[PDB]
Design an enzyme around this catalytic site. Structure first.
Site: not given
Length: 493
Positions: A425, A430
């Protein structure tokens, strides 16, 4: 030890508690909804700095971004002068006595319920601490010992006198955590030789997959927040080395200078440019669930795209999972490391062709051809899966992610000798940790069926030990809702 984190505390509670029992340089972290606050004492005053976690990183406002709160505290404790307005110093961490975040603390729990749970789930050395039935204010530590009528469960009273806790004789402790730590290293011994060894606490988190619908409701009336905070308190056990990431030769290879890969799980690149000083580094970690593996890496930078394609080629990966747009909220989160549709690009020594792009509802599939420039019989197909509908700050419904992971898992399983599924990401934690953890959980359910034991926090902790992984409580709740939704659609018969 992370004890500087006070879970149940208000703002003025922190100020009075820092002024009455603290000096200039004392600090503590407090949650209160979705962000955190670091209260620091300075020249007789108390300042409150805020940390915002949108699911990508801990962003101390006016400062740096970090993977964990302990890394934030440790960094500014060693880098005094960079936390400014006037200079702010993180000198003395003020410890909290509240034991709710501890695994061995069961809180309100009777004596017979503790004997039952220690019988069903505990082994030799399993212990717990509960509020005492007989006398208010005091506590009880119940520990199971024996062999694995060959075992027993011993109860030890822990009376609370003038805000201090003791066994009835000997040392008096400031908190129940200190009493547990001491008698865990200096165990109590009965008058007949048997030693009350505190090995590992009781696991109140291993859940059978069939009961997921009830457990999510038990944590919905906050249960999710209490369990997530318990999991967060264990981050100080995962302070492994990151020396290769902190090298000045690799400084310009990280999207964020304080979110670094662990040295023991990082991806080491080989056959690199001999003129480049350090050509083996990439902000990535081999994620091995402890059956496919993963590579959690950051979003590509303009100067790391060539190393990225070196990594995919070296690790023989055939599937990439992108869980962010190139630009989000006006800021670049991952440069476009793939060619345009029908194009052919050269990324250093690697050559990539974009054969076809297929647009689904929540993602876009790109069929890429990775080959070594100047080499034959090296071409292979890399299937890039770009999830494009993840919110900027979690999805209200996990249907799209589960469909996304189902198609990703079916393509990975269809390629023999395929390397780890590269998932990335912005920072690589996360969103990336959420996707990988969910994929591990549904893979267990897909194989062993709906009658298998899962443990979300334990699985997360196992993955967090390989990359410094899940970020917010919302993602934590979303993992549960995704597991619940997967069980629900699998049982349609």
């Amino acid at each position: 030890s992370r004890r500087w984190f006070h879970p149940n505390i208000t703002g003025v509670e922190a100020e009075n508690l820092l002024l009455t029992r603290g000096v200039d340089g004392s600090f503590l972290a407090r949650p209160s909804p979705g962000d955190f606050t670091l209260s620091v004492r300075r020249n007789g005053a108390v300042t409150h700095i805020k940390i915002q976690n949108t699911g990508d990183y801990y962003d101390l406002y006016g400062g740096e971004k970090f993977a964990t709160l302990a890394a934030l505290v440790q960094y500014y404790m060693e880098h005094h002068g960079q936390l400014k307005e006037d200079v702010i110093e993180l000198k003395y961490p003020l410890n909290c006595a509240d034991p709710t975040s501890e695994r061995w603390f069961h809180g309100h729990l009777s004596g017979k319920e503790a004997e039952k749970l220690l019988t069903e789930k505990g082994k030799h050395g399993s212990f717990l601490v509960r509020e005492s039935q007989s006398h208010p204010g005091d506590f009880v530590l119940s520990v199971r010992t024996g062999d694995d009528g060959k075992s027993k469960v011993t109860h030890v009273m822990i009376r609370c006198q003038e805000l201090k806790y003791d066994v009835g004789g000997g040392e008096r402790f400031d908190s129940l955590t200190d009493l547990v730590e001491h008698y865990k290293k200096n165990p109590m011994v009965e008058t007949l030789g048997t030693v009350l060894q505190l090995k590992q606490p009781l696991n109140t988190t291993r859940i059978n997959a069939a009961e997921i619908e009830s457990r999510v409701r038990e944590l919905s009336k906050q249960g999710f927040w209490e369990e997530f905070e318990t999991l967060q308190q264990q981050e100080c056990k995962l302070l492994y080395s990151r020396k290769e990431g902190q090298r000045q030769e690799n400084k310009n290879k990280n999207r964020y200078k304080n979110i670094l890969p662990f040295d023991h799980t990082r991806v080491v690149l080989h056959d690199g440019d001999p003129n480049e000083p350090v050509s083996d580094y990439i902000n990535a970690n081999i994620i091995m669930p402890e059956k496919k593996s993963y590579i959690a890496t950051q979003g590509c930078l303009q100067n790391t795209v060539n190393d990225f394609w070196r990594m995919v080629f070296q690790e023989n990966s055939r599937v990439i999972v992108m869980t962010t747009k190139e630009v989000e909220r006006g800021k670049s989160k991952c440069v476009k490391y793939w060619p345009d549709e029908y194009a052919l690009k050269e990324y250093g020594v690697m050559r990539v062709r974009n054969v076809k792009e297929s647009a689904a509802h929540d993602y876009t599939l790109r069929e890429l051809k990775l080959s070594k420039v100047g080499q034959g019989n090296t071409e292979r197909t890399v299937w890039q899966y770009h999830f494009r509908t993840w919110p900027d700050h979690v999805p209200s419904d996990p249907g799209g992610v589960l469909d996304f992971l189902e198609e990703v898992h079916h393509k990975q399983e269809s390629i023999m000798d395929a390397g780890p599924v590269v998932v990335h990401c912005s920072a690589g934690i996360g969103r990336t940790g959420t996707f990988i953890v969910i994929d591990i959980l549904i893979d267990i359910i897909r194989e062993k069926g709906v009658d298998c034991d899962i443990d979300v926090p334990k699985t997360i902790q196992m993955v967090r030990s390989q990359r410094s992984m899940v970020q917010t409580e919302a993602q934590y709740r979303f993992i549960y809702m995704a597991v619940q939704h997967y069980i629900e659609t699998l049982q349609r018969r």
